[PDB]
């Protein structure tokens, strides 16, 4: 039954294709780690802890809930079967009625009544699947040497692999592509690391999929050698023989906003006080728009992808504006228009997204006497007797002391709570419908 469910997952998307030798090796790991009920529980726990990290968050929740449902359907009675079925139905708003009356089931009904859909979905992992796996646990408990780390856009695993290499004290080599010189350098580095070992990083190989078809099929036990390649979940299809011979890892984008601001401002290494203040505001706005990007049903209407390139171009534009102004009168309207209708609206092909981006620009680049960028904290205007280092210290201090609230997706992005609750309800409906399609078939 578990293998049938995983075959369905592999049929849903081209990245989830699960082999059979992997399943048998996971079953071997069940006994390796340290009566029939205990063996079955260890089977379920080990299979989830091995095959969760090869899926995205939505399919993670789907597989967790389906595994809990199958275990409770086989172990518990018919009343709990009907209760679980009707809770899954009311999650998708298909079956209406209270479950038959269990402390944990009462907690589920309390969470459903309070419309906390993400907590209801994560309750299964909170209750049954106690153990969790990160990227380090996957790479440490893997016998292979070739790894694929795919993810969505608006995020990258370069810093995560940097942290992993620092943790393992291994010299990593990030190899960007784009030129035949880059391809030759990557080939030479591969031919070197196939002898002397070492961790080698490959990034955004979907554009070089043709080079993959040319070289990797013909190419594919050294110590401290693990080849990493990064793909995109929305990209082109990778070859199946390449995918079956490697371990698959999916990374999740961070949910915070202040962390993004800190990460952006920690790389803007320097133009005096005004340039630094402009770069600070630009980092805040890039973080806010990147946070609003993922909210596809309500905040936006289409999943755009604002990388750091448009932030860099906006920084260049602000530098050029600040250079040609000796009167200390910043043209707020000009920079607002250029950000709204060229920089962060050039790729936009819809009117409503342009209007909301312009509204956010007016909210951020107003240049008021005392701006309230978020309801939590207010950034005062700089004074007229400061150098660059004093302003940098002041901005870092005013960045550190801020508190990220639990409603950052509503208060900081200026959205009604009903929209976010509707988005979460739609996600719950999708998860429940998918797990029903897994159940009845």
């Amino acid at each position: 039954k578990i293998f049938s469910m995983l075959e369905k997952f592999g049929q849903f998307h081209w990245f989830y294709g699960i082999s059979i030798g992997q399943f048998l090796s996971c079953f071997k790991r069940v006994f390796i780690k340290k009566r029939v009920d205990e063996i079955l529980w260890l089977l379920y726990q080990e299979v989830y802890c091995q095959f969760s990290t090869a899926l995205d968050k939505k399919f993670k929740m789907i597989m967790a809930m389906t595994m809990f449902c199958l275990y409770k359907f086989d172990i518990e009675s018919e009343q709990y079967k009907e209760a679980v079925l009707t809770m899954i139905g009311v999650l998708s708003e298909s079956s209406d009625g209270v479950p038959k009356l269990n402390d944990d089931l009462r907690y589920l009904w309390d969470y459903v009544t309070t419309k906390s859909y993400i907590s209801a979905l994560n309750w299964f992992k909170n209750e049954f699947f106690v153990d969790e796996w990160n990227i380090a646990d996957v790479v440490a408990n893997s016998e292979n040497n070739y790894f694929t780390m795919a993810s969505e856009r608006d995020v990258d695993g370069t810093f995560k692999l940097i942290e992993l290499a620092k943790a393992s004290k291994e010299s990593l080599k990030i190899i960007p592509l784009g030129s035949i010189e880059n391809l030759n350098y990557a080939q030479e580095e591969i031919s070197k690391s196939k002898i002397e070992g070492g961790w080698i990083l490959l990034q955004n190989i979907q554009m070089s999929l043709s080079w993959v078809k040319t070289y990797l099929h013909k190419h594919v036990e050294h110590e401290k050698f693990k080849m990493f390649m990064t793909c995109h979940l929305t990209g082109d299809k990778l070859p199946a023989p390449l995918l079956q011979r490697t371990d698959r890892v999916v990374y999740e984008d961070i949910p915070g906003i202040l962390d993004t601001v800190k990460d952006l401002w920690g790389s803007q290494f320097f133009s005096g006080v005004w340039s630094v203040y402009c770069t600070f505001l630009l980092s805040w706005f890039h973080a806010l728009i990147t946070a609003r990007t993922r909210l596809v049903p309500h905040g936006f209407s289409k999943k755009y992808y604002f990388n750091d390139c448009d932030f860099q171009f906006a920084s260049v534009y602000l530098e050029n504006v600040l250079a040609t102004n000796s009167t200390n009168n910043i043209p707020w309207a000009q920079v607002r228009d250029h950000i709204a209708t060229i920089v962060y609206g050039g790729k936009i092909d819809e009117e409503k997204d342009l209007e909301v981006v312009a509204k956010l620009c007016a909210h951020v680049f107003c240049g008021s006497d005392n701006l309230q960028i978020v309801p939590g904290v207010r950034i005062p205007q700089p004074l007229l007797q400061q150098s660059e280092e004093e302003e940098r210290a002041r901005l870092t201090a005013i960045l550190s002391n801020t508190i990220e609230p639990a409603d950052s997706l509503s208060s900081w992005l200026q959205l009604p709570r009903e929209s976010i609750l509707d988005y979460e309800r739609l996600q719950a409906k999708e998860v429940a419908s998918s797990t029903e399609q897994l159940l009845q078939e």
Binding site: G178, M207, P331, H338, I342, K347, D349
Partner: protein, 884 residues
């Protein structure tokens, strides 16, 4: 032998004649000398492949010669003494110069340029040296025209005398410069009315000069008035600004032109400012090309292109077709005084790309999504390499595995039509999505430049009318209501103003003449209702009695019927061939197309007294090689195709008849894009024919091209919009009209009494009943009865003609019965002759019950023997077949 001799003479003129060029390939030149002394084709081809490195060095000597292939370039090199074959192919060099006048050069559209000084010519001068000298000379001529125009304008001289002497480019950018300076001087104070009035009287005086000018002066003046309307609009907007912040923002958004007053250089002395962003003017001659009407969204596109190109990253457009991306790119490029090459969608593409990156010009890609995976990947990799080399500031780039120099001003532009580019391109490109351009502003400014007294209101009305047409009419394949159709309508308004005058009537009449032929029937009624409801003019009928009388005379001469639908189609074809050159006639099968244009030919031959020559040609019957030509690769021999032979014979004009006659070449077959893209150069306003050998055969103005087709599923909208499209919604006749025309035709192919009896016997009362009864009958290979009337007539009248030898010895009743029986048999074997036997007997019963019981009832096996009415039972001959 001939090919070897020609190649030997060409290579001798290339390498043997000139000295000190054989050092790069000494062994190859020695082999060439040995084969020349011996005189082979294979050795010559191998040498010319080995001479590509020498050819590459030759193209590196003057990079502007790279734009041609091997054959054209070797033709250029061989004719290095007579100073010929170079000026003829000058169009492919710069795109805005057609020929060389050394006194000067002449533009593609027809503008002459005068050099600052003459350049000495000798028979021992290689092409590259004087080509580069001519390029420097024309650039310096543009610079000195800039400086003397600035001196004259700052002196106080009016624009009307400057515009009549210098080039449009110089006066245009001088007016831009002085407009920037005086708007700045107005910005240092709070006064804007005086410069607004000054540019207003400047526009009015330029219009007064325009209305009595020649063709080139009219084009140049319009190309100046578009920017002067821009200046008027900008100053009017700046005057309307409440605060100085809005004025500063609007002035930073729009383009500004500045000239450095301290740099000793000339080409690096004029820069363009927009929101603090600097771009370098190139000062390349462009002539008087098409100037886009300026809109605020055009300025936004200009601003985002400038913002992208400041950081050494090219621009990239994407959006629905018809929003004006490629024309926006072209206007931006020629606004900087440089020519942007245009790619229409691998070896030739990569060669053009490496030539672009080694010349430093701009590359524009149109409709990027029609490439295969391999060529798309290779082109994306090449563009990524070029752009990374530009970003890294590399003097040379490793593009296509050759070391070629990289200019810092090279840019690549790509347009897309989504409903995509790879990851590497989008990592190094900026995307812009323009909306629907304001057709109100374009229409208003083109109407103001055409002198319409009511411009804004009429433009709003016409764009609202086009929106209503697009939102109400059917969703046919060939229906285009974008900006192309509006621009074509307002262009075709130009010849109509001499008879209808400026105002609503000319716009309504041109709207009819352009839109109405291309619509169906319910679409035509919707168009008429919307035109009556929105526009005030009711469309009074003009005085055209002579032409309709001539059409009626030609129709009665050829036996045709003058039904009002046929008159409407004839008038549409005549008014559409008055202006448009290449016409397309579309309708159902056998709906009266060839008859229509033949009637038009006869009628206006009568009307004008002008001779007509017709060359009927089927498109699909002849192959591509036989239609135009076939370069015989065995000996590089040229065999002229039928159309090209006709064009050469009409260009030669040995008899001199074609100087006083009209020549039509119809194309009576289904349209093939492979057969129409080969003559796209004839299609547009260029009116020139390209050939595989490179000849540019001109087309006389009376040399018309026609197309006849039954469908438009396999025809591109590009040729549809450029052609005048005539649509036959229904048949142009009645059944009685066609039956009478066929009877008259076969009569031409007691005789008067017989003709009267035949014409009276085809009484429409029972004929319509039996025709609508047979229309409900199942016919194999189902064709309309309108296509069976021909069979019916040609069978019946031939039977009567063959039986005419026994028509003087029988009674009137017997003759009537014989005629009726023959007619019944003919209509049986024409209408229901393609149906089953039971249905044939049913149609026999229907004929008998619908022609009356008094008439002779035709039996299922009846016949006439030599005369009496017999049955087919008696004519069966018994056969005695043998054993084996």
């Amino acid at each position: 032998w001939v090919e070897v001799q020609f190649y030997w003479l060409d290579l001798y003129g290339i390498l043997g004649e000139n000295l000190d060029i054989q050092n790069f390939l000494p062994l190859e030149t020695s082999k060439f000398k040995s084969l020349t002394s011996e005189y082979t084709i294979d050795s010559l081809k191998m040498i010319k492949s080995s001479l590509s490195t020498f050819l590459e060095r030759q193209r590196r000597q003057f990079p502007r010669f790279y734009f041609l292939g091997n054959d054209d370039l070797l033709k250029i090199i061989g004719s290095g003494k007579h100073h010929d074959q170079v000026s003829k192919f000058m169009k492919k060099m710069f795109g805005s110069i057609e020929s060389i006048i050394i006194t000067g050069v002449r533009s593609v559209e027809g503008e002459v340029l005068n050099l600052n000084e003459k350049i000495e010519l000798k028979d021992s001068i290689q092409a590259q040296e004087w080509l580069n000298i001519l390029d420097t000379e024309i650039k310096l001529s543009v610079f000195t025209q800039f400086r003397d125009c600035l001196g004259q304008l700052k002196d106080g001289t009016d624009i009307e005398v400057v515009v009549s002497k210098y080039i449009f480019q110089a006066i245009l950018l001088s007016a831009q410069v002085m407009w920037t300076e005086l708007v700045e001087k107005c910005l240092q104070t709070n006064e804007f009315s005086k410069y607004w009035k000054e540019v207003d009287m400047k526009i009015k005086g330029l219009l007064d000069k325009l209305n009595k000018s020649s063709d080139n002066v009219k084009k140049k003046i319009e190309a100046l008035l578009v920017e002067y309307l821009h200046f008027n609009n900008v100053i009017g907007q700046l005057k309307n600004c409440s605060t100085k912040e809005e004025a500063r923002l609007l002035w930073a958004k729009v383009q500004k032109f500045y000239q450095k007053n301290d740099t000793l250089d000339d080409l690096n002395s004029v820069f363009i400012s927009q929101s603090g962003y600097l771009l370098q003017y190139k000062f390349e001659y462009i002539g008087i090309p098409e100037r886009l009407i300026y809109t605020p969204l055009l300025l936004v596109g200009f601003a985002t292109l400038t913002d992208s190109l400041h950081q050494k990253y090219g621009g990239c457009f994407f959006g629905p077709a018809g929003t004006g991306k490629t024309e926006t790119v072209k206007a931006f490029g020629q606004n900087l005084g440089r020519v942007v090459v245009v790619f229409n969608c691998y070896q030739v593409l990569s060669r053009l790309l490496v030539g672009i990156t080694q010349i430093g010009a701009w590359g524009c890609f149109d409709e990027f999504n029609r490439l295969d995976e391999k060529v798309l990947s290779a082109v994306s990799a090449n563009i990524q390499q070029i752009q990374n080399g530009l970003q890294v500031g590399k003097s040379h780039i490793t593009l296509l595995e050759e070391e070629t120099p990289l200019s810092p001003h090279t840019a690549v532009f790509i347009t897309l039509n989504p409903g995509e580019l790879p990851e590497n391109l989008k990592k190094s490109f900026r995307e812009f999505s323009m909306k629907s351009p304001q057709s109100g502003t374009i229409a208003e400014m083109i109407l103001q430049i055409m002198g319409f007294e009511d411009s804004k209101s009429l433009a709003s009305k016409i764009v609202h009318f086009l929106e209503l047409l697009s939102s109400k009419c059917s969703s046919m394949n060939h229906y285009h209501f974008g900006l192309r159709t509006l621009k074509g309508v307002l262009r075709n308004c130009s010849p109509l103003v001499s008879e209808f005058g400026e105002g609503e009537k000319t716009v309504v009449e041109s709207l009819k003449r352009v839109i109405l032929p291309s619509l169906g029937d319910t679409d035509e009624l919707v168009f008429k209702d919307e035109l009556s409801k929105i526009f005030d003019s009711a469309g009074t009928p003009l005085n055209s009695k002579a032409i309709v009388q001539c059409l009626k005379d030609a129709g009665q001469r050829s036996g045709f019927s003058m039904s009002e639908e046929f008159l409407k189609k004839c008038m549409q074809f005549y008014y559409m061939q008055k202006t448009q050159q290449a016409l397309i006639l579309v309708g159902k099968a056998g709906c009266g197309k060839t008859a229509t244009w033949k009637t038009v030919i006869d009628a206006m031959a009568i009307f004008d007294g002008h001779a007509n020559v017709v060359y009927v040609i089927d498109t699909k019957v002849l192959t591509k090689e036989s239609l135009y030509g076939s370069m015989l690769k065995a000996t590089l021999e040229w065999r002229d195709g039928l159309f090209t032979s006709i064009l050469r014979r009409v260009n030669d004009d040995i008899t001199g008849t074609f100087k006083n006659s009209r020549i039509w070449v119809v194309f009576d077959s289904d349209l093939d894009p492979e057969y129409v893209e080969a003559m796209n150069s004839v299609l547009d306003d260029n009116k020139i024919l390209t050939l595989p050998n490179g000849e540019r055969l001109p087309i006389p103005p009376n040399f018309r091209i026609l197309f006849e087709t039954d469908n438009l599923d396999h025809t591109t909208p590009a040729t549809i919009t450029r052609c005048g499209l005539l649509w036959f919604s229904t048949d142009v006749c009645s059944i009685s009209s066609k039956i009478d025309h066929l009877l008259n035709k076969s009569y031409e192919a007691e005789l008067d009494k017989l003709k009267d009896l035949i014409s009276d016997s085809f009484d429409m009362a029972s004929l319509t009943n039996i025709f609508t009864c047979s229309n409900d009958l199942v016919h194999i290979l189902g064709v309309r009865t309108f296509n069976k009337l021909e069979t019916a007539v040609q069978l019946a009248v031939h039977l009567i003609s063959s039986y005419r030898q026994w028509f003087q010895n029988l009674d009137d009743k017997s003759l009537k019965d014989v005629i009726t029986l023959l007619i019944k048999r003919s209509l049986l074997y024409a209408l229901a002759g393609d149906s089953t036997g039971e249905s044939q007997r049913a149609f026999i019963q229907t004929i008998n019950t619908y022609f009356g019981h008094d008439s002779q009832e035709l039996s299922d096996y009846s016949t006439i023997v030599i005369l009496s009415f017999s049955s087919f039972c008696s004519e069966i001959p018994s056969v005695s077949l043998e054993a084996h």
